[PDB]
Curated annotation (Swiss-Prot):
Free-text tissue specificity from the UniProt record: Expressed in brain, heart, kidney, liver, pancreas, placenta and skeletal muscle.
Domain of life: Eukaryota
Parent sequence residues shown: 700 to 1040 of 1040
Subcellular location: Nucleus
Protein name: DNA cross-link repair 1A protein
Source species of the chain: Homo sapiens
Assembly and binders: Binds constitutively to TP53BP1. Binds CDC27, which is itself a component of the anaphase promoting complex (APC). Binds PIAS1.
Induction remark: During mitosis. The mRNA encoding this protein contains an internal ribosome entry site (IRES) in its 5'-UTR. This 5'-UTR generally suppresses translation while specifically promoting expression during mitosis, when cap-dependent translation may be impaired.
UniProt similarity note: Belongs to the DNA repair metallo-beta-lactamase (DRMBL) family.
Amino acid sequence: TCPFYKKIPGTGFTVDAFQYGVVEGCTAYFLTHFHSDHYAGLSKHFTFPVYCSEITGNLLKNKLHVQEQYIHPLPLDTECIVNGVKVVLLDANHCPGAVMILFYLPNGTVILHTGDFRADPSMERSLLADQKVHMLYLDTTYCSPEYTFPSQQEVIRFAINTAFEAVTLNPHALVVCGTYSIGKEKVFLAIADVLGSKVGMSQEKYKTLQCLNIPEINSLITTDMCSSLVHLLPMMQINFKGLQSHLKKCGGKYNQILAFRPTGWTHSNKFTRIADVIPQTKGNISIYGIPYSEHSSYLEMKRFVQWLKPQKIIPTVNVGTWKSRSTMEKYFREWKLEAGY
Ligand code: NI
């Protein structure tokens, strides 16, 4: 059944709750972003109002064929009325079109639902600064102190310098980048930009990217693989078997692959710096795992919450085990005692 952490009290609303059938008493279904664990259940047969960002609405229409009459896109940073309740969508610094949702309940309670987010100090100067938030529905994906990772900027700097050096040493090297969802477009776009290439990809992936309102996108991507030296493939294909196979397909245009797998966290982060990352190599194939995250680190999450000072926190991730739930509740209490709220 629909879990309680997907329901917004005092409303008829649910958040990211499309796989339970008809949720009894739900008058409006919000969708924070277009990732499959969140949209699971939507299709062209859905006949209830869906509230979301413009970008998420483009992907619902074009990829899932949800009918236009049920898609209700809202602008960001704008007070809107939904079934009689004031809401605001805020940028979540996750993947394209990803939002956080502020609900202003008739009784005076204010609720923030983060969806999936990567907390950032810039959020401390949004419409969040303007009033008190009583309840926080929090993306706790990396809510443990072992989860450190570098800034997105440091990671992109590493990838750009690595690719540029490899291809300048060998003009017959191909660069490959893995993907299985929207998000992390900076990795492959930044590398293509430094090499003066477009990124080549499948028709299905090109269609997905043309939904994202990225400026000058027609200048950066293509379905012509032959004219491109940065290829996107399914993340599943980013291994030695899959990459050897792909190299055969390029008809001796290339004699070397340099591949990037943008992982979330991997336990080489507890020891190794970004400057010190090395690839796995077999023959003329090298694979780099790079820690490009679109979720908060433990420290970024802690700063956000100690800034916001909510009265109650409801985790939305890692809620399935008692040991996880109990550990998270211990960090929340530490945070509150250290900061004094
Ligand atoms: Ni997500």
